[PDB]
Design a protein around this ligand. Structure first.
Ligand SMILES: Cc1nn(-c2cccc3cc(Cc4cccc(C(F)(F)F)c4)sc23)c(CO)c1C(=O)NCCO
Lengths: 295, 351, 227
């Protein structure tokens, strides 16, 4: 395929990534519209979590669909430097907040299995709002060194010129991002879901438990599509291997994770399943009394 | 005495019913009863079917969709009427016998039965901006004439009247609702004891709450304010365990208590709908068409019942929350608070 | 368990008076305090009512925009401001309490205050207008309603001077506190109660009420005398 052709003719994998962006924005639009046109607040604790995760991934879809237009819409090749920097920063922050928000879903809806006797006391609306503000501040502060000039945060923003041919990652940066964003995420998911799976065994179990059959599915596919990103971040930045096409495929899988996730979430829970299994197929008088004879 | 009549818009399908408002006990269900009178000359071969659908409406108050309709029904029982069930001899009631005696042998009766583990007829508050079908669970009884269940129900020949299922008070109450939670702060290991009590457990609607608080502030801190508020816990259970925490009436009093001092005086609260007009998501007990009603009667269930199957469950718990001060060697006015739960079943009596 | 009445006097036309009634033992958030006017030598007529649980305020044709009625839950008191009094407002005002949930007639009343002035709509019809009967005479008084109400009517036995009391509601059940001899029945739009054993104490004027629609109003009025 064509190489160094951003200014020469055109690029063909733009179609693949625009398909990924279209899928991501479609799934996130349908999840947001389901949760906003039919306000149900189901599992109120997890409700704001999953709604903000849908928001964050919709933003990641829009901001990584921006290149699909503004890569060949105009005379590209003038001021992409700060554009690439801010775009890589914003997409990486959005993906970090999506992942940490899923981890916080797992750690919050775990107390509904072990400690439900005072569950409505630890988690409130103000506490969860503070937790979301803290999660966004944490993602911004952990990815601030990316814009500070210490390196680029993964292969999210290699679609441009400088940050594909000139920018290089730092081992001191990939170690940081693994150590305080991904390794704690694995720790939280392990230490929560192992305890959960120790209790899914029956005593021989509620709507609070029947959500596990879909949340375990969600996190399992999320880690299946997240596996070939941490290894590649720890590999190429440590100067052991570097494959253009493999990096493209891995990054595409790791961004399409947030396209496949809302689709299978809506395909899991029955508030949207009733909206598909039933939707796929396609004046009165006055209540007057009478007279009944008594005994 | 009196029997309700609805009649079809065409003027053919007329359904009678004994009592629009139906009671429900812990382990006994009041059965619905009614008769259907229709001209057999019109019904050449069509069969009249009468059903009870316990609708759950959750999607706004706007128009429906092409195929979504944002609805689900937790219990749909259909009973044949034409012919008058020759296969099974239903236990004909005194009301049914009297109704069939008032008219001729033309009418054919029907009878349903409701499992106890079903939600009381409560409709959530539509809100001021919404104008349409309301949220919440709403019972329904409809009779239609057709040849099969899968066939379309002809609305121009369809009759529909709304019933409501409402629970009535337990005559014998429990001892009292009491709860006492203390809290020890990091500054000093001298926790303060808080005690709360109510007059009874079952309250007729509109009766005054009589909360009796008792605090012994032994810590080296001051209680800035005391907040008392009955909070409507509307446990919506569709496929989840979503919970709501809407307050109903909050009364405050700046009756501060000095450190190493006690304080005990009763407060009076009254839950009512006049000042809760704008609180969206509130639970109201029953709606026929639009008539204003009381707050949601507390749906009591039998002890040990499966509390994870029902449609909407509302319960009332009063919070005795008081805010403390973080004054000290290095501290600001902002601080935390300690609150105690207290449940009580505010719901109607029986005439 | 009882409601007092106060604020009587004589007011010239164009004046105002904030006549108020106070009740003890009746929760204001469980009882909708009413307000009625009995014209001098004529029939009683409902004028205003406030249901504090709902925060509503209903009026009548001669009352809407004329006077103001309010109540406070702190003092368990209802204050009726009789602003812009006219010639037609000359009446005695009785403060009456009804169960604010599932209206069951007017249970408790007040002593009443006399107000005088100096320098759609439905109407129940009661027959006979006057009657004289002795002890043991079977007497039936018919209250014929122009528009058919939903079997929700009440009868009141108002002796001279004293405030009327409640005996029947929905024409079926007698209020707890009355002798079991009293009865009642419904026949279409015609409502009839039976008085046969006419005791000396029971000889008093009777009145029919229909609590079905807004602008709730009494009938025409009947009297019981000795033949
Ligand atoms: C155009 C182009 N692509 N590429 C790549 C070649 C091989 C791998 C990758 C991986 C990328 C990261 C990514 C992958 C998928 C979705 C996204 C997203 F940001 F859209 F979400 C980002 S870009 C890219 C280059 C390299 O230089 C260029 C270019 O600038 N000139 C072509 C030189 O041959």
């Amino acid at each position: 395929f064509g190489h160094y052709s951003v200014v020469d003719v055109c690029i063909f994998e733009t179609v693949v990534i625009v398909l990924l962006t279209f899928l991501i924005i479609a799934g996130n639009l349908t999840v947001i519209f389901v949760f906003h046109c039919a306000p149900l607040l189901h599992h109120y604790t997890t409700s704001y979590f999953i709604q903000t995760m849908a928001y964050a991934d919709l933003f990641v879809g829009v901001s990584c669909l921006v290149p699909t237009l503004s890569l060949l819409h105009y005379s590209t090749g003038v001021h992409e430097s700060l554009t690439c920097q801010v775009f890589g920063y914003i997409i990486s922050v959005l993906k970090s907040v999506s992942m940490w928000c899923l981890a916080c879903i797992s750690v919050d809806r775990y107390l509904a299995i072990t400690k439900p006797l005072s569950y409505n006391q630890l988690v409130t609306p103000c506490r969860l709002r503070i937790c979301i503000i803290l999660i966004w501040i944490y993602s911004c502060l952990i990815f601030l060194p990316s814009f500070f000039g210490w390196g680029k945060p993964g292969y999210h923003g290699d679609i441009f010129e400088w940050c594909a041919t000139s920018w290089l990652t730092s081992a001191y940066f990939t170690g940081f991002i693994v150590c305080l964003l991904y390794a704690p995420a694995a720790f939280v998911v392990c230490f929560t879901y192992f305890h959960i799976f120790k209790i899914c065994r029956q005593h021989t179990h509620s709507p609070d438990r029947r959500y596990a059959m879909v949340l375990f599915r969600i996190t399992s596919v999320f880690y299946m599509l997240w596996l070939p990103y941490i290894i590649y971040f720890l590999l190429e930045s440590s100067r052991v291997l570097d494959n253009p096409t493999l990096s493209f495929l891995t990054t595409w899988l790791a961004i399409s994770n947030s396209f496949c996730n809302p689709v299978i979430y809506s395909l899991s829970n029955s508030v949207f399943r009733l909206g598909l299994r039933r939707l796929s197929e396609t004046e009165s008088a006055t209540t007057a009394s009478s007279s009944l004879a008594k005994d | 005495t009196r029997v309700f009549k609805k009649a079809s818009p065409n003027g053919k399908l007329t359904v009678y019913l004994g009592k629009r408002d139906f009671v429900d006990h812990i382990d006994l269900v009041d059965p619905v009863d009614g008769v259907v009178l229709v001209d057999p000359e019109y019904l050449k071969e069509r069969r009249v079917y009468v059903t009870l659908t316990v609708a759950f409406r959750y999607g706004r108050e706007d128009l429906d969709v092409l195929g979504l309709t944002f609805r689900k029904d937790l219990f749909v029982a259909n009973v044949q009427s034409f012919p008058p069930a020759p296969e099974d001899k239903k236990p004909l009631t005194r009301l049914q016998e009297r109704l069939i005696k008032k008219l001729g042998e033309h009418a054919y009766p029907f009878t349903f039965e409701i499992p106890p583990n079903l939600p009381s007829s409560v409709t959530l508050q539509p809100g001021p901006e919404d104008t349409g079908k309301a949220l919440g669970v709403d019972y329904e009884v409809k009779a239609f004439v057709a040849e099969n269940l899968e066939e379309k129900i002809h609305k121009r020949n369809s009759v529909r009247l709304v019933i409501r299922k409402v629970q009535y008070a337990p005559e014998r109450p429990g001892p009292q609702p009491t709860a006492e939670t203390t809290r020890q702060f990091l500054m000093s290991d001298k926790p303060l004891h808080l005690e709360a009590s109510l007059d009874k457990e079952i309250y007729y609607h509109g009766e005054p709450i009589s909360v009796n608080v008792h605090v012994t502030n032994n810590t080296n801190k001051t209680v800035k304010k005391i907040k008392i508020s009955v909070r409507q816990y509307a446990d919506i259970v569709l496929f989840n365990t979503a919970q709501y925490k809407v307050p109903v009436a909050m009364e405050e009093a700046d009756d501060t208590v000095a450190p190493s001092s006690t304080f005990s005086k009763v407060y009076t609260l009254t839950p009512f709908l006049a000042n809760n007009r704008e609180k969206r998501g509130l639970a109201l007990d029953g709606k026929l068409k639009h008539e204003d009603t009381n707050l949601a009667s507390s749906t009591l269930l039998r002890e040990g019942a499966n509390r994870e199957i029902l449609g909407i469950i509302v319960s009332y718990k009063v919070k005795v929350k008081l805010v403390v001060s973080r004054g000290g060697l290095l501290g600001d006015l902002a601080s935390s608070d300690v609150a105690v739960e207290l449940p009580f079943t505010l719901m109607h009596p029986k005439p | 368990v009882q409601l007092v009445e106060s604020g009587g006097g004589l007011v010239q036309p164009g004046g105002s008076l904030r006549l108020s009634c106070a009740a003890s033992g009746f929760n204001v958030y469980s009882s909708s305090i009413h307000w009625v006017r009995q014209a001098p030598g004529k029939g009683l007529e409902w004028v205003a009512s406030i249901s504090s649980y709902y925060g509503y305020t209903y009026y009548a044709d001669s009352v809407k925009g004329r006077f103001t009625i309010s109540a406070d839950t702190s003092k368990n008191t209802a204050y009726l401001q009789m602003n812009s009094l006219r010639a037609e407002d000359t009446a005695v005002y009785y403060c009456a309490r009804s169960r604010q949930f599932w209206y069951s007639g007017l249970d408790y009343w007040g002593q009443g205050t006399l107000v005088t002035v100096s320098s759609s709509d439905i109407q129940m019809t009661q027959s006979p207008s006057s009657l004289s009967a002795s002890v043991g005479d079977r007497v039936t008084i018919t209250c014929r309603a122009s528009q058919s109400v939903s079997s929700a009517v009440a009868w009141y036995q108002q002796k001279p001077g004293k405030a009327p009391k409640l005996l029947i509601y929905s024409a079926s059940s007698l209020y707890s506190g009355v002798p079991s001899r009293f009865s009642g029945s419904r026949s279409g739009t015609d409502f009839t109660l039976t008085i046969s054993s006419l005791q000396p104490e029971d000889f008093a004027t009777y009145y029919c009420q229909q609590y079905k629609y807004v602008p709730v109003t009494f009938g025409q009025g009947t009297k019981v005398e000795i033949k």
